[PDB]
Design an enzyme around this catalytic site. Structure first.
Site: not given
Ligand SMILES: Cc1cc2nc3c(=O)[nH]c(=O)nc-3n(C[C@H](O)[C@H](O)[C@H](O)COP(=O)(O)OP(=O)(O)OC[C@H]3O[C@@H](n4cnc5c(N)ncnc54)[C@H](O)[C@@H]3O)c2cc1C
Length: 373
Positions: A104, A211
């Site tokens: 990742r 995996y």
């Molecule tokens: C145990 C587990 C296993 C998973 N396995 C998978 C998998 O195999 N495949 C898959 O596709 N998904 C998987 N997921 C889901 C995936 O981890 C998340 O859904 C994904 O990270 C969401 O992406 P995002 O960009 O919406 O949020 P995030 O990945 O959380 O990114 C948000 C970003 O915004 C930043 N941020 C937050 N608040 C602020 C702020 N106020 N100002 C500026 N920056 C900020 C954070 O620092 C972060 O960098 C899994 C989740 C979990 C919990």
């Protein structure tokens, strides 16, 4: 006409790459003081590999990650195979792209490197965001501020954009937990014959997904889902131990037991019991990923949904332009809420690939073939 993306996760950096490639003026603001390669695995189905193809990243990602021939669902206690979901060459032919499992952190780094240099800023923590009507003012914790015509909410589960839009949100207790660990060493080479490329071990109230992370099969990753006491720690992750995992997975197949012995450092992450309903947009703010539709991770599709949101949102902004953001945000919710709801009700049943079922509705989805109407 400028787009401000809050959050440089997998979803936000995907929107940044796709919107910039389309000709838009996009800047990203991330609260992390530095970039960290997460140090975990992630699964990427063919439906999202097609989005990476539009970024020019699919061919590269096929080179790092592992290409499992099958998804095996196995009973944790007996090791009986509950399902053998064909992937590999079948997935490439039947779904138009490869099913890969990959590091990742290296995917996250390659994704941000696809953004135009000098447009991604770290140490930028959003504290206040004001929809002034014609524009939006972003206030950062370091005293600096910026302005854009629309703001994209990609701040994840603890989204500050959703907070300023809907309020503080009710507290959610963490009654489940997820152990994670990367396994390298001769402990992996000693039992490599019994370590399958992509397998989920199920039991009555817990599971362990395992995996490989690269094509070289030199790194093995597992992630669990175990009942746990209420998480009341100052951090989002605490160090676990082999004794904790042995007690948590007592009675599991020797392969699972060999995995716990092969670890060096195990971290533990809390999982939320409930999530709010989706919030797609309001005014000039639009949301994607965990910020928009937080879910239980039982389907391993969360990050894939965040990238799918980024791709669909770019298709809608390409149709209307920033001058007509309201139509873009309406078209983006209308072209994503059914798919998001389907994924939601499947993680609700917690049955994804438990038995032999057809995964075509997830992997074979054509985001770029859909009519926006
Ligand atoms: C145990 C587990 C296993 C998973 N396995 C998978 C998998 O195999 N495949 C898959 O596709 N998904 C998987 N997921 C889901 C995936 O981890 C998340 O859904 C994904 O990270 C969401 O992406 P995002 O960009 O919406 O949020 P995030 O990945 O959380 O990114 C948000 C970003 O915004 C930043 N941020 C937050 N608040 C602020 C702020 N106020 N100002 C500026 N920056 C900020 C954070 O620092 C972060 O960098 C899994 C989740 C979990 C919990």
């Amino acid at each position: 006409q400028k787009i401000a993306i809050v959050g440089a996760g997998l979803g936000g950096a995907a929107a940044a790459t796709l919107l910039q490639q389309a000709g838009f003026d996009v800047e990203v603001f991330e609260q992390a003081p530095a970039f960290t390669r997460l140090g975990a695995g992630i699964q990427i189905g063919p439906n999202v590999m097609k989005i990476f193809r539009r970024m020019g990243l699919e061919q590269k990602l096929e080179l790092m990650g592992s290409h499992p021939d099958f998804w095996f669902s196995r009973d944790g206690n007996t090791g009986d195979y509950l399902s053998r979901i064909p992937l590999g060459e079948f997935a490439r032919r039947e779904y138009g792209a490869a099913y890969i499992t990959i590091h990742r952190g290296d995917l996250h780094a390659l994704q941000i490197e696809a953004i135009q240099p000098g447009t991604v800023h770290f140490g930028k923590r959003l504290e206040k965001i004001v929809d002034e009507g014609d524009q939006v003012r972003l206030d950062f914790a370091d005293g600096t501020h910026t302005v854009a015509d629309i703001v994209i909410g990609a701040d994840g589960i603890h989204s500050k954009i959703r907070e300023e839009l809907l309020g503080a949100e009710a507290p959610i207790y963490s009654g489940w937990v997820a152990h994670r660990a990367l396994i390298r060493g001769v402990n992996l080479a000693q039992h490599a014959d019994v370590f399958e490329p992509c397998v989920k071990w199920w039991s009555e109230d817990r599971h362990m997904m395992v995996y490989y992370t690269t094509g070289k099969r030199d790194e093995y990753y597992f992630v669990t889902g175990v009942p746990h006491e209420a998480w009341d720690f100052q951090g989002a992750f605490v160090d676990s131990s082999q004794e904790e995992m042995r007690a948590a997975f007592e009675g599991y197949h020797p392969t699972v037991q060999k995995l716990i012995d092969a670890t060096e450092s195990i971290t533990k992450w809390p999982l939320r019991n409930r999530n709010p309903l989706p919030l797609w947009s309001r005014g000039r703010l639009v949301l994607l990923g965990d910020a928009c539709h937080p879910m239980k991770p039982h389907m391993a599709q969360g990050a894939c949904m965040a990238i799918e949101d980024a791709a669909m949102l770019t298709r809608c902004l390409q149709e209307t332009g920033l001058s007509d953001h309201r139509t873009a945000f309406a078209l983006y919710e209308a072209n994503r809420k059914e798919r998001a709801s389907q994924v939601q009700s499947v993680s609700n049943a917690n049955t994804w690939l438990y038995s032999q079922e057809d995964p075509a509705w997830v992997y074979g989805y054509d985001l770029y073939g859909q009519q926006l109407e």
